[PDB]
Protein backbone atom coordinates (compact mmCIF):
# COMPACT_ATOMS: atom_id res chain seq x y z
CA UNK A 1 0.00 0.00 0.00
CA UNK A 2 1.42 3.27 -1.28
CA UNK A 3 -0.79 6.36 -1.11
CA UNK A 4 -1.88 7.23 -4.66
CA UNK A 5 -2.50 10.80 -5.70
CA UNK A 6 -4.44 11.66 -8.85
CA UNK A 7 -3.19 14.75 -10.67
CA UNK A 8 -4.83 16.12 -13.83
CA UNK A 9 -3.07 18.34 -16.46
CA UNK A 10 -5.50 20.68 -18.24
CA UNK A 11 -5.33 23.55 -20.80
CA UNK A 12 -5.72 24.32 -24.49
CA UNK A 13 -4.76 22.01 -27.33
CA UNK A 14 -1.00 22.29 -28.28
CA UNK A 15 0.27 24.15 -25.21
CA UNK A 16 2.43 21.11 -24.34
CA UNK A 17 0.54 19.15 -21.70
CA UNK A 18 1.83 15.81 -23.06
CA UNK A 19 5.44 17.01 -23.32
CA UNK A 20 5.28 18.43 -19.75
CA UNK A 21 3.79 15.27 -18.32
CA UNK A 22 6.34 13.19 -20.22
CA UNK A 23 8.99 15.27 -18.32
CA UNK A 24 7.21 14.68 -14.95
CA UNK A 25 7.21 10.94 -15.77
CA UNK A 26 10.37 10.05 -17.70
CA UNK A 27 12.67 13.07 -17.42
CA UNK A 28 12.50 13.16 -21.24
CA UNK A 29 10.96 15.44 -23.91
CA UNK A 30 8.87 13.43 -26.48
CA UNK A 31 9.73 15.06 -29.75
CA UNK A 32 6.97 13.30 -31.74
CA UNK A 33 3.68 13.58 -29.81
CA UNK A 34 0.29 12.72 -31.24
CA UNK A 35 -2.76 14.87 -30.52
CA UNK A 36 -3.98 13.31 -27.23
CA UNK A 37 -7.44 11.73 -27.55
CA UNK A 38 -9.40 11.33 -24.35
CA UNK A 39 -7.13 11.27 -21.32
CA UNK A 40 -3.70 9.63 -21.26
CA UNK A 41 -2.67 7.89 -18.05
CA UNK A 42 0.86 7.77 -16.65
CA UNK A 43 2.24 6.76 -13.23
CA UNK A 44 5.22 7.99 -11.24
CA UNK A 45 6.41 6.51 -7.91
CA UNK A 46 7.99 9.09 -5.66
CA UNK A 47 9.96 8.55 -2.43
CA UNK A 48 9.57 11.45 -0.06
CA UNK A 49 10.99 11.25 3.49
CA UNK A 50 10.80 7.44 3.53
CA UNK A 51 7.23 7.30 2.25
CA UNK A 52 6.64 5.89 -1.18
CA UNK A 53 3.83 7.75 -2.92
CA UNK A 54 2.26 7.04 -6.33
CA UNK A 55 1.47 9.97 -8.63
CA UNK A 56 -1.14 9.18 -11.24
CA UNK A 57 -1.04 11.84 -14.01
CA UNK A 58 -4.10 12.31 -16.22
CA UNK A 59 -2.96 14.24 -19.33
CA UNK A 60 -6.15 15.54 -21.02
CA UNK A 61 -7.14 16.38 -24.60
CA UNK A 62 -7.57 20.11 -24.73
CA UNK A 63 -9.99 20.78 -27.62
CA UNK A 64 -13.26 22.48 -26.51
CA UNK A 65 -15.35 19.64 -27.95
CA UNK A 66 -13.82 17.10 -25.59
CA UNK A 67 -13.83 19.58 -22.65
CA UNK A 68 -17.65 19.99 -22.74
CA UNK A 69 -18.08 16.29 -23.52
CA UNK A 70 -16.20 14.30 -20.90
CA UNK A 71 -13.13 15.93 -19.22
CA UNK A 72 -15.77 16.67 -16.51
CA UNK A 73 -16.06 12.99 -15.46
CA UNK A 74 -12.31 12.58 -15.22
CA UNK A 75 -12.56 15.26 -12.47
CA UNK A 76 -13.61 12.81 -9.76
CA UNK A 77 -11.28 12.09 -6.83
CA UNK A 78 -8.49 14.40 -8.09
CA UNK A 79 -5.81 15.44 -5.64
CA UNK A 80 -4.13 18.31 -7.61
CA UNK A 81 -4.45 20.37 -10.82
CA UNK A 82 -1.70 21.50 -13.22
CA UNK A 83 -3.11 24.27 -15.37
CA UNK A 84 -1.03 24.85 -18.54
CA UNK A 85 -0.86 27.64 -21.03
CA UNK A 86 1.58 28.31 -23.91
CA UNK A 87 3.58 31.46 -23.14
CA UNK A 88 3.75 32.17 -26.91
CA UNK A 89 -0.01 32.14 -27.32
CA UNK A 90 -2.08 34.78 -25.47
CA UNK A 91 -5.43 33.07 -26.30
CA UNK A 92 -4.26 29.93 -24.52
CA UNK A 93 -3.64 32.10 -21.48
CA UNK A 94 -7.11 33.73 -21.96
CA UNK A 95 -8.91 30.26 -21.88
CA UNK A 96 -7.69 29.75 -18.37
CA UNK A 97 -10.68 31.41 -16.47
CA UNK A 98 -12.96 28.98 -18.38
CA UNK A 99 -10.76 25.99 -17.42
CA UNK A 100 -10.91 27.19 -13.83
CA UNK A 101 -14.73 27.57 -13.93
CA UNK A 102 -14.95 24.12 -15.38
CA UNK A 103 -12.96 22.74 -12.44
CA UNK A 104 -15.16 24.42 -9.78
CA UNK A 105 -18.56 23.42 -11.21
CA UNK A 106 -17.53 19.78 -12.04
CA UNK A 107 -15.94 18.94 -8.69
CA UNK A 108 -16.36 18.68 -4.84
CA UNK A 109 -13.16 20.43 -3.48
CA UNK A 110 -11.48 23.90 -3.26
CA UNK A 111 -8.47 23.34 -0.95
CA UNK A 112 -6.57 21.11 -3.48
CA UNK A 113 -3.09 22.06 -4.64
CA UNK A 114 -2.97 23.64 -8.03
CA UNK A 115 -0.21 25.18 -10.03
CA UNK A 116 -0.15 27.30 -13.11
CA UNK A 117 2.55 26.47 -15.68
CA UNK A 118 3.44 28.76 -18.61
CA UNK A 119 5.29 26.59 -21.11
CA UNK A 120 7.48 27.03 -24.16
CA UNK A 121 9.58 29.84 -22.69
CA UNK A 122 12.31 28.93 -25.01
CA UNK A 123 10.42 30.65 -27.75
CA UNK A 124 11.85 33.95 -26.50
CA UNK A 125 10.90 36.16 -29.46
CA UNK A 126 7.42 34.74 -29.65
CA UNK A 127 6.43 35.16 -25.95
CA UNK A 128 3.10 37.02 -25.74
CA UNK A 129 2.28 36.53 -22.06
CA UNK A 130 4.48 38.71 -19.77
CA UNK A 131 5.23 37.26 -16.33
CA UNK A 132 3.51 40.10 -14.41
CA UNK A 133 0.17 39.44 -16.23
CA UNK A 134 0.43 35.73 -15.43
CA UNK A 135 1.49 36.29 -11.82
CA UNK A 136 -1.44 38.58 -11.12
CA UNK A 137 -3.66 35.86 -12.58
CA UNK A 138 -2.08 33.16 -10.43
CA UNK A 139 -2.30 35.47 -7.35
CA UNK A 140 -6.08 36.05 -7.91
CA UNK A 141 -6.60 32.26 -7.86
CA UNK A 142 -4.15 31.85 -5.09
CA UNK A 143 -1.88 29.41 -6.88
CA UNK A 144 1.87 29.47 -7.76
CA UNK A 145 3.14 30.37 -11.21
CA UNK A 146 6.04 28.74 -13.07
CA UNK A 147 7.38 29.87 -16.42
CA UNK A 148 9.33 27.06 -18.10
CA UNK A 149 10.14 24.92 -21.13
CA UNK A 150 9.37 21.19 -21.48
CA UNK A 151 11.64 21.16 -24.53
CA UNK A 152 14.77 23.22 -23.47
CA UNK A 153 17.36 20.77 -22.08
CA UNK A 154 18.84 23.59 -19.97
CA UNK A 155 15.44 23.64 -18.08
CA UNK A 156 14.75 20.00 -17.38
CA UNK A 157 16.07 19.92 -13.80
CA UNK A 158 13.84 22.96 -13.30
CA UNK A 159 10.77 21.13 -14.65
CA UNK A 160 11.75 18.25 -12.32
CA UNK A 161 11.83 20.85 -9.49
CA UNK A 162 8.41 22.28 -10.43
CA UNK A 163 6.99 18.69 -10.30
CA UNK A 164 8.66 17.94 -6.91
CA UNK A 165 6.99 21.05 -5.51
CA UNK A 166 3.51 19.52 -5.99
CA UNK A 167 4.71 16.13 -4.82
CA UNK A 168 5.98 17.67 -1.59
CA UNK A 169 2.64 19.56 -1.01
CA UNK A 170 0.52 16.45 -1.60
CA UNK A 171 2.74 14.33 0.66
CA UNK A 172 2.21 16.82 3.56
CA UNK A 173 -1.63 16.22 3.63
Amino acid sequence: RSRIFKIIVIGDSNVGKTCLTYRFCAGRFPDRTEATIGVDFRERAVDIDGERIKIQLWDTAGQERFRKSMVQHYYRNVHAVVFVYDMTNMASFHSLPAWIEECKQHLLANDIPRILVGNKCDLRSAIQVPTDLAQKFADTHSMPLFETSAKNPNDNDHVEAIFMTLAHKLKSH
Binding site: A35, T36, G38, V39, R42, Q63, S69
Partner: protein, 331 residues
Protein backbone atom coordinates in the same frame (compact mmCIF):
# COMPACT_ATOMS: atom_id res chain seq x y z
CA UNK B 1 0.80 -19.74 -59.56
CA UNK B 2 -2.20 -21.85 -58.59
CA UNK B 3 -0.19 -23.02 -55.57
CA UNK B 4 0.86 -19.51 -54.54
CA UNK B 5 -1.72 -18.03 -52.20
CA UNK B 6 -1.29 -14.28 -52.90
CA UNK B 7 -1.34 -14.84 -56.75
CA UNK B 8 -4.50 -16.94 -56.56
CA UNK B 9 -6.41 -14.45 -54.36
CA UNK B 10 -5.46 -11.58 -56.75
CA UNK B 11 -6.78 -13.73 -59.57
CA UNK B 12 -10.09 -14.21 -57.78
CA UNK B 13 -10.33 -10.42 -57.37
CA UNK B 14 -9.54 -9.90 -61.08
CA UNK B 15 -12.41 -12.27 -61.94
CA UNK B 16 -14.82 -9.92 -60.09
CA UNK B 17 -13.25 -6.56 -61.05
CA UNK B 18 -11.66 -6.96 -64.43
CA UNK B 19 -13.21 -6.68 -67.90
CA UNK B 20 -16.72 -6.34 -66.50
CA UNK B 21 -19.49 -3.97 -67.40
CA UNK B 22 -21.17 -3.98 -64.01
CA UNK B 23 -19.10 -5.06 -61.03
CA UNK B 24 -21.03 -7.42 -58.84
CA UNK B 25 -21.17 -5.69 -55.45
CA UNK B 26 -22.26 -8.66 -53.32
CA UNK B 27 -19.57 -10.85 -54.85
CA UNK B 28 -16.95 -8.16 -54.03
CA UNK B 29 -18.29 -7.72 -50.42
CA UNK B 30 -18.10 -11.52 -49.71
CA UNK B 31 -14.55 -11.86 -50.87
CA UNK B 32 -13.27 -8.52 -49.45
CA UNK B 33 -14.58 -9.31 -45.98
CA UNK B 34 -11.61 -11.66 -45.74
CA UNK B 35 -8.85 -9.13 -46.78
CA UNK B 36 -8.02 -7.35 -50.00
CA UNK B 37 -4.80 -7.76 -51.86
CA UNK B 38 -2.85 -4.45 -51.57
CA UNK B 39 -2.86 -4.11 -55.41
CA UNK B 40 -6.65 -4.00 -55.37
CA UNK B 41 -7.48 -1.89 -52.27
CA UNK B 42 -7.67 1.54 -53.86
CA UNK B 43 -10.35 0.53 -56.45
CA UNK B 44 -12.17 -1.99 -54.08
CA UNK B 45 -12.31 0.45 -51.15
CA UNK B 46 -13.83 3.11 -53.45
CA UNK B 47 -16.46 0.62 -54.79
CA UNK B 48 -17.30 -0.72 -51.34
CA UNK B 49 -17.72 2.64 -49.69
CA UNK B 50 -20.19 3.67 -52.40
CA UNK B 51 -17.96 6.27 -54.06
CA UNK B 52 -16.92 4.70 -57.34
CA UNK B 53 -19.78 3.45 -59.58
CA UNK B 54 -20.11 -0.32 -60.02
CA UNK B 55 -20.98 0.29 -63.69
CA UNK B 56 -17.51 0.61 -65.15
CA UNK B 57 -18.50 2.77 -68.10
CA UNK B 58 -19.85 5.43 -65.66
CA UNK B 59 -16.56 5.61 -63.70
CA UNK B 60 -14.44 8.03 -65.70
CA UNK B 61 -17.24 10.64 -65.99
CA UNK B 62 -18.22 10.29 -62.30
CA UNK B 63 -14.71 10.87 -60.94
CA UNK B 64 -14.24 13.72 -63.35
CA UNK B 65 -17.33 15.40 -61.92
CA UNK B 66 -16.39 14.67 -58.25
CA UNK B 67 -12.74 15.74 -58.76
CA UNK B 68 -13.88 19.02 -60.43
CA UNK B 69 -16.35 19.63 -57.64
CA UNK B 70 -13.53 19.31 -55.09
CA UNK B 71 -11.39 21.77 -57.19
CA UNK B 72 -14.37 24.20 -57.42
CA UNK B 73 -14.74 23.92 -53.61
CA UNK B 74 -11.03 24.68 -53.11
CA UNK B 75 -11.32 27.67 -55.44
CA UNK B 76 -14.37 28.99 -53.55
CA UNK B 77 -12.79 28.27 -50.11
CA UNK B 78 -9.59 30.22 -50.86
CA UNK B 79 -11.33 33.32 -52.29
CA UNK B 80 -13.34 36.26 -50.88
CA UNK B 81 -16.55 34.18 -51.12
CA UNK B 82 -15.38 32.28 -47.97
CA UNK B 83 -14.56 33.91 -44.69
CA UNK B 84 -11.90 31.67 -43.23
CA UNK B 85 -12.83 30.01 -39.97
CA UNK B 86 -9.56 30.63 -38.10
CA UNK B 87 -10.04 28.47 -34.99
CA UNK B 88 -10.82 25.45 -37.25
CA UNK B 89 -8.08 26.20 -39.73
CA UNK B 90 -5.65 26.47 -36.80
CA UNK B 91 -6.71 23.33 -34.87
CA UNK B 92 -6.20 21.27 -38.04
CA UNK B 93 -2.81 23.07 -38.65
CA UNK B 94 -1.47 22.07 -35.24
CA UNK B 95 -2.81 18.44 -35.50
CA UNK B 96 -1.36 17.58 -38.91
CA UNK B 97 2.37 17.61 -37.90
CA UNK B 98 1.30 15.49 -34.98
CA UNK B 99 -0.56 12.98 -37.23
CA UNK B 100 1.20 9.59 -37.63
CA UNK B 101 4.52 11.16 -36.35
CA UNK B 102 6.51 7.96 -36.89
CA UNK B 103 5.50 7.50 -40.54
CA UNK B 104 7.80 9.54 -42.77
CA UNK B 105 5.04 10.14 -45.35
CA UNK B 106 3.24 12.39 -42.94
CA UNK B 107 6.14 14.80 -42.46
CA UNK B 108 6.36 15.74 -46.11
CA UNK B 109 5.09 19.27 -46.54
CA UNK B 110 3.22 18.21 -49.69
CA UNK B 111 1.25 15.61 -47.69
CA UNK B 112 0.57 18.07 -44.86
CA UNK B 113 -0.87 20.65 -47.27
CA UNK B 114 -3.03 17.94 -48.86
CA UNK B 115 -4.46 16.91 -45.46
CA UNK B 116 -5.05 20.54 -44.45
CA UNK B 117 -7.27 21.07 -47.50
CA UNK B 118 -9.18 17.77 -47.11
CA UNK B 119 -9.88 18.25 -43.42
CA UNK B 120 -10.73 21.94 -43.56
CA UNK B 121 -13.21 21.46 -46.49
CA UNK B 122 -14.77 18.54 -44.67
CA UNK B 123 -15.01 20.61 -41.44
CA UNK B 124 -16.59 23.80 -42.97
CA UNK B 125 -19.17 21.56 -44.69
CA UNK B 126 -20.11 19.90 -41.37
CA UNK B 127 -20.68 22.79 -38.96
CA UNK B 128 -22.58 20.52 -36.42
CA UNK B 129 -19.23 18.90 -35.49
CA UNK B 130 -16.58 21.11 -36.98
CA UNK B 131 -13.18 19.47 -36.93
CA UNK B 132 -12.73 17.21 -33.89
CA UNK B 133 -9.29 15.79 -32.92
CA UNK B 134 -8.91 12.25 -34.09
CA UNK B 135 -10.54 12.88 -37.46
CA UNK B 136 -6.93 13.73 -38.64
CA UNK B 137 -6.20 10.00 -37.85
CA UNK B 138 -9.25 8.76 -39.74
CA UNK B 139 -8.37 10.52 -43.02
CA UNK B 140 -4.98 8.77 -43.28
CA UNK B 141 -5.88 5.13 -44.10
CA UNK B 142 -7.72 6.46 -47.19
CA UNK B 143 -5.01 8.93 -48.09
CA UNK B 144 -2.19 6.43 -47.89
CA UNK B 145 -4.12 3.62 -49.51
CA UNK B 146 -5.29 5.77 -52.41
CA UNK B 147 -1.63 6.81 -53.00
CA UNK B 148 -0.62 3.19 -53.58
CA UNK B 149 -2.70 3.12 -56.76
CA UNK B 150 -0.18 5.58 -58.16
CA UNK B 151 2.72 3.23 -57.50
CA UNK B 152 4.00 0.22 -59.38
CA UNK B 153 3.04 -2.86 -57.44
CA UNK B 154 6.68 -3.47 -56.48
CA UNK B 155 6.85 -0.07 -54.68
CA UNK B 156 3.45 -0.31 -52.86
CA UNK B 157 5.43 -1.17 -49.73
CA UNK B 158 7.46 2.12 -50.02
CA UNK B 159 4.37 4.31 -49.84
CA UNK B 160 5.28 5.24 -46.27
CA UNK B 161 8.63 6.65 -47.28
CA UNK B 162 8.30 8.30 -50.73
CA UNK B 163 7.19 11.89 -51.24
CA UNK B 164 4.05 11.78 -53.44
CA UNK B 165 5.65 14.71 -55.36
CA UNK B 166 8.30 12.38 -56.77
CA UNK B 167 5.87 10.14 -58.57
CA UNK B 168 2.65 12.14 -59.04
CA UNK B 169 2.07 15.39 -60.83
CA UNK B 170 0.18 18.05 -58.86
CA UNK B 171 -3.06 17.40 -60.78
CA UNK B 172 -2.91 13.71 -59.72
CA UNK B 173 -2.46 14.81 -56.10
CA UNK B 174 -5.51 17.01 -56.39
CA UNK B 175 -7.41 14.03 -57.89
CA UNK B 176 -6.34 11.86 -54.92
CA UNK B 177 -7.30 14.62 -52.48
CA UNK B 178 -10.83 14.72 -54.01
CA UNK B 179 -11.22 10.92 -53.67
CA UNK B 180 -9.86 11.05 -50.12
CA UNK B 181 -12.30 13.92 -49.29
CA UNK B 182 -15.39 12.17 -50.69
CA UNK B 183 -14.47 8.83 -49.10
CA UNK B 184 -13.75 10.44 -45.71
CA UNK B 185 -17.19 12.13 -46.06
CA UNK B 186 -18.86 8.71 -46.59
CA UNK B 187 -17.07 7.25 -43.56
CA UNK B 188 -18.02 10.09 -41.26
CA UNK B 189 -21.70 10.11 -42.30
CA UNK B 190 -21.86 6.59 -40.80
CA UNK B 191 -20.93 7.98 -37.37
CA UNK B 192 -22.12 11.60 -37.27
CA UNK B 193 -23.31 11.62 -33.59
CA UNK B 194 -19.75 10.66 -32.62
CA UNK B 195 -18.45 14.23 -33.08
CA UNK B 196 -21.34 16.66 -32.44
CA UNK B 197 -21.50 18.61 -29.15
CA UNK B 198 -21.32 16.19 -26.23
CA UNK B 199 -20.12 13.32 -28.52
CA UNK B 200 -23.24 11.26 -27.59
CA UNK B 201 -22.26 8.75 -30.34
CA UNK B 202 -19.11 7.84 -28.43
CA UNK B 203 -20.77 7.79 -25.03
CA UNK B 204 -23.51 5.41 -26.31
CA UNK B 205 -20.84 3.13 -27.88
CA UNK B 206 -18.85 2.98 -24.64
CA UNK B 207 -22.07 2.09 -22.69
CA UNK B 208 -22.96 -0.56 -25.30
CA UNK B 209 -19.44 -1.97 -24.93
CA UNK B 210 -19.71 -2.07 -21.12
CA UNK B 211 -23.00 -3.97 -21.31
CA UNK B 212 -21.64 -6.43 -23.97
CA UNK B 213 -18.63 -7.26 -21.83
CA UNK B 214 -20.84 -7.79 -18.75
CA UNK B 215 -22.77 -10.39 -20.80
CA UNK B 216 -19.86 -12.12 -22.67
CA UNK B 217 -17.25 -11.90 -19.89
CA UNK B 218 -18.85 -11.19 -16.41
CA UNK B 219 -15.71 -12.12 -14.50
CA UNK B 220 -13.63 -9.48 -16.40
CA UNK B 221 -16.42 -6.91 -15.81
CA UNK B 222 -16.56 -7.66 -12.03
CA UNK B 223 -12.76 -7.46 -11.77
CA UNK B 224 -12.99 -3.96 -13.38
CA UNK B 225 -15.63 -2.88 -10.79
CA UNK B 226 -13.36 -4.21 -8.02
CA UNK B 227 -10.49 -2.05 -9.24
CA UNK B 228 -12.59 0.99 -10.26
CA UNK B 229 -11.72 0.53 -13.96
CA UNK B 230 -14.13 2.56 -15.98
CA UNK B 231 -14.70 1.74 -19.61
CA UNK B 232 -14.46 5.40 -20.53
CA UNK B 233 -10.82 5.58 -19.33
CA UNK B 234 -9.58 3.53 -22.31
CA UNK B 235 -12.55 3.04 -24.64
CA UNK B 236 -13.25 6.68 -25.46
CA UNK B 237 -10.11 6.74 -27.73
CA UNK B 238 -11.26 3.29 -29.13
CA UNK B 239 -14.45 4.84 -30.43
CA UNK B 240 -13.20 8.31 -31.36
CA UNK B 241 -10.34 6.98 -33.63
CA UNK B 242 -11.94 3.59 -34.51
CA UNK B 243 -9.10 1.67 -32.82
CA UNK B 244 -6.52 3.48 -34.97
CA UNK B 245 -4.60 4.47 -31.89
CA UNK B 246 -4.28 0.81 -30.68
CA UNK B 247 -2.76 -0.71 -33.84
CA UNK B 248 -0.12 -0.22 -36.52
CA UNK B 249 -1.30 1.44 -39.73
CA UNK B 250 -0.88 -1.87 -41.59
CA UNK B 251 -3.30 -3.59 -39.19
CA UNK B 252 -5.81 -0.69 -39.49
CA UNK B 253 -5.70 -0.80 -43.29
CA UNK B 254 -6.38 -4.55 -43.27
CA UNK B 255 -9.17 -4.14 -40.71
CA UNK B 256 -10.81 -1.54 -42.96
CA UNK B 257 -11.02 -4.09 -45.84
CA UNK B 258 -13.52 -5.80 -43.47
CA UNK B 259 -15.26 -2.68 -42.03
CA UNK B 260 -15.96 -1.42 -45.59
CA UNK B 261 -17.30 -4.77 -46.76
CA UNK B 262 -19.34 -5.28 -43.55
CA UNK B 263 -20.94 -1.82 -43.77
CA UNK B 264 -21.09 -1.58 -47.63
CA UNK B 265 -24.69 -0.51 -48.53
CA UNK B 266 -24.92 -5.83 -43.77
CA UNK B 267 -24.30 -4.10 -40.37
CA UNK B 268 -23.84 -0.52 -39.23
CA UNK B 269 -20.31 0.72 -38.47
CA UNK B 270 -21.18 1.70 -34.85
CA UNK B 271 -22.54 -1.75 -34.08
CA UNK B 272 -19.85 -3.79 -35.71
CA UNK B 273 -17.09 -1.61 -34.12
CA UNK B 274 -18.44 -2.26 -30.55
CA UNK B 275 -18.25 -6.04 -31.21
CA UNK B 276 -14.71 -5.62 -32.48
CA UNK B 277 -13.77 -3.66 -29.37
CA UNK B 278 -15.46 -6.35 -27.14
CA UNK B 279 -13.51 -9.09 -28.97
CA UNK B 280 -10.27 -7.00 -28.62
CA UNK B 281 -10.77 -6.37 -24.94
CA UNK B 282 -11.70 -10.00 -24.13
CA UNK B 283 -8.61 -11.16 -26.01
CA UNK B 284 -6.52 -9.77 -23.09
CA UNK B 285 -8.98 -10.99 -20.36
CA UNK B 286 -6.41 -13.34 -18.91
CA UNK B 287 -3.58 -10.84 -18.53
CA UNK B 288 -6.15 -8.24 -17.36
CA UNK B 289 -7.66 -10.48 -14.60
CA UNK B 290 -4.40 -10.24 -12.68
CA UNK B 291 -4.01 -6.48 -13.02
CA UNK B 292 -4.67 -3.59 -10.67
CA UNK B 293 -6.08 -0.26 -11.81
CA UNK B 294 -2.85 1.39 -12.96
CA UNK B 295 -1.77 -1.78 -14.82
CA UNK B 296 -5.11 -2.13 -16.54
CA UNK B 297 -5.19 1.52 -17.76
CA UNK B 298 -1.56 1.54 -18.90
CA UNK B 299 -2.00 -1.73 -20.76
CA UNK B 300 -5.33 -0.84 -22.48
CA UNK B 301 -3.87 2.50 -23.56
CA UNK B 302 -0.70 0.76 -24.82
CA UNK B 303 -1.84 -2.70 -25.98
CA UNK B 304 0.91 -5.14 -27.24
CA UNK B 305 -0.24 -5.13 -30.90
CA UNK B 306 2.97 -3.90 -32.69
CA UNK B 307 3.66 -7.34 -34.24
CA UNK B 308 0.12 -8.36 -35.13
CA UNK B 309 -0.18 -9.92 -38.64
CA UNK B 310 -3.23 -9.90 -40.99
CA UNK B 311 -4.08 -13.24 -39.35
CA UNK B 312 -4.11 -11.81 -35.82
CA UNK B 313 -6.63 -9.19 -37.04
CA UNK B 314 -8.64 -11.63 -39.15
CA UNK B 315 -9.17 -13.84 -36.05
CA UNK B 316 -10.40 -10.81 -34.06
CA UNK B 317 -12.75 -9.74 -36.83
CA UNK B 318 -14.24 -13.19 -37.25
CA UNK B 319 -14.86 -13.47 -33.51
CA UNK B 320 -16.56 -10.02 -33.47
CA UNK B 321 -18.72 -11.13 -36.39
CA UNK B 322 -19.68 -14.37 -34.60
CA UNK B 323 -20.51 -12.51 -31.36
CA UNK B 324 -22.53 -9.96 -33.34
CA UNK B 325 -24.77 -12.85 -34.40
CA UNK B 326 -24.86 -14.64 -31.08
CA UNK B 327 -25.28 -11.72 -28.74
CA UNK B 328 -27.73 -9.80 -30.98
CA UNK B 329 -30.82 -10.23 -28.73
CA UNK B 330 -29.30 -7.93 -26.12
CA UNK B 331 -30.28 -4.21 -25.71
Amino acid sequence: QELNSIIQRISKFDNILKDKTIINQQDLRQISWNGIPKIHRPVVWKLLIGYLPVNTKRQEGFLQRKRKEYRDSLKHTFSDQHSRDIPTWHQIEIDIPRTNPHIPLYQFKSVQNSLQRILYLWAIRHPASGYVQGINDLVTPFFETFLTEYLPPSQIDDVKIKDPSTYMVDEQITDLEADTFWCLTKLLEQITDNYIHGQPGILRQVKNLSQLVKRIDADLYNHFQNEHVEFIQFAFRWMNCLLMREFQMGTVIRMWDTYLSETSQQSSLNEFHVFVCAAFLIKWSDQLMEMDFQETITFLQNPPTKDWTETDIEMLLSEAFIWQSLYKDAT
